[PDB]
């Protein structure tokens, strides 16, 4: 009725979807092989799984997701792992030979043989169910099929569906922490579709999650499993107001109009505030007014850009658990009291507030704790303009000596597409300037 479809792309996006579908399965009663485990016991009041599952004829729930990869090895751990008896075997779409850190392979010459499959399998899923609030896709900038096929999926999915909303989730390169030398060449040139053909494109850096774990939690050396568990608690907080009812609930339509001022300023941030080691949750309080002051701390952001340099355009607040509405309104006016927290001259209102009654669930073996309260602070901020200022400089430094170009140009890519991407991001460095000064 109020559903969503989760389309996963690439090796980064599949391993998000190994973490999400573990965590939605724990939030309902669903076992890893379907099978709602009630056995001859009566129950009444249900259908909180229509947003991410489909009850079929045998009583077995199958989720709405397509898994897309151009690599065989990543997806075939799902086909032999524990969740093999949950996904429909047509919905684990597998490529044959990978893009290998290449926009031109993932967008011009290898995704052509596979795009006919995925757009048949999506249309099978959506015709099946009534409404559609919107897709929630997952990808990564720094790789071939994560940014090539994703740039071809979004150009084709915005034509034939249109007015149904989209979301977008990204893995964004760091200043320091990089894994490829192809990383600036394809994190500049993937913006020709994540500007025109995305309604909200959330932004997550690997570097701050590498640093938020060492400081809030008593963990050192965190691997990629611990990065996936944290972003699984964001997507299970944006969509939590669809399933479990609340006093003030926001749908996917509701925070879209409260957060993007102009239709080329859709690059918000996100933070999760009550991140705390399970030993440390015994110690502090984590009140209703403690965890909202933590959302604006520069140590606990998500992209390594200083929040004390830009101006906040809009904020959406997604509270979860036992929250009273008087304590929320005591918190917000305290933030506008302090004068080192900067809001734009044409926005005195500032905030959008959502509250759900469902407490944030725990995961077994997870380093996150059990806390009665949680919040996920969405914000659109001028400080992300200074985050492309360390990527345009890593692009023209590359491009002047024409290093690593001959792979792209031999695959159906013309050299007029490189410098066209550089002006289309140097244009956006004025769109985030021209709405900064006062009147």
């Amino acid at each position: 009725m109020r559903e969503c479809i989760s389309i996963h792309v690439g090796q980064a996006g599949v391993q998000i979807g190994n973490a999400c579908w573990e965590l939605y399965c724990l939030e309902h009663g669903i076992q890893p092989d379907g099978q709602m485990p009630s056995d001859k016991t009566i129950g009444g009041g249900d259908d909180s799984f229509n947003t991410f599952f489909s009850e079929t004829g045998a009583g077995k729930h199958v989720p709405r997701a397509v898994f897309v990869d151009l690599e065989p090895t990543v997806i075939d751990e799902v086909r032999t792992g524990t969740y093999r008896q949950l996904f429909h075997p047509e919905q684990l779409i597998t490529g044959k030979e990978d893009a290998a850190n290449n926009y031109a392979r993932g967008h011009y010459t290898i995704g052509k043989e596979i795009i006919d499959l995925v757009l048949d399998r999506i249309r099978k899923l959506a015709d099946q169910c009534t409404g559609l609030q919107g897709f929630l896709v997952f990808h990564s900038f720094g790789g071939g099929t994560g940014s090539g096929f994703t740039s071809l999926l979004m150009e084709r999915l915005s034509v034939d569906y249109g007015k149904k909303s989209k979301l977008e989730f990204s893995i964004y390169p760091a200043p320091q922490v990089s894994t490829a030398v192809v990383e600036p060449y394809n994190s500049i040139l993937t913006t020709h579709t994540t500007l025109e053909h995305s309604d909200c494109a959330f932004m997550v850096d690997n570097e701050a999650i590498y640093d938020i774990c060492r400081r809030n939690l008593d963990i050192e050396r965190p691997t990629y499993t611990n990065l996936n568990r944290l972003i699984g608690q964001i997507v299970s907080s944006i969509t939590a107001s669809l399933r479990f009812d609340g006093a003030l609930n926001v749908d996917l339509t509701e925070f879209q109009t409260n957060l993007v001022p102009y239709p080329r300023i859709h690059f918000p941030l996100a933070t999760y505030a009550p991140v705390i080691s399970a030993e440390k949750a015994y110690h502090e309080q984590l009140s209703v007014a403690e965890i909202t002051n933590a959302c604006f701390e520069p140590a606990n952001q998500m992209v390594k850009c200083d929040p004390r340099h830009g101006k906040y355009m809009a904020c959406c607040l997604l509270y979860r658990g036992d929250v009273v509405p008087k304590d929320v309104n005591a918190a917000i006016a305290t933030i506008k009291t302090k004068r080192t927290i900067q809001f734009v001259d044409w926005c005195p209102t500032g905030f959008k507030v959502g509250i759900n009654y469902q407490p944030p669930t725990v995961v077994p073996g997870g380093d996150l704790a059990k806390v009665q309260r949680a919040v996920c602070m969405l914000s659109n901020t001028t400080a992300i303009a200074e985050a492309w200022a360390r990527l345009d400089h890593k692009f023209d430094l590359m491009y002047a000596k024409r290093a690593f170009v001959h792979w792209y140009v031999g695959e159906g890519m013309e050299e007029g597409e490189f410098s066209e991407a550089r002006e289309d991001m140097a244009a956006l460095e004025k769109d985030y300037e021209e709405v900064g000064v006062d009147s």
């Binding site: 004829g57 045998a58 009583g59 077995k60």
Partner: protein, 49 residues
């Protein structure tokens, strides 16, 4: 008074037949559920074969 008493009796009779309709609908729904369970069972049997 006589007409009022007849009205009350007839209204109670119709609410009794509506309660009968409610019970038969619940019976039909449980019948559909047991049909679904039977289909799941013999599909599992075919997989074993």
């Amino acid at each position: 008074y006589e007409q009022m008493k007849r009205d009350a009796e007839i209204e109670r009779i119709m609410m009794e037949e509506h309660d009968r309709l409610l019970k038969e609908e619940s019976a039909k729904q449980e019948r559909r559920n047991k049909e679904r369970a039977q289909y799941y069972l013999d599909l599992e049997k075919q997989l074993e074969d």
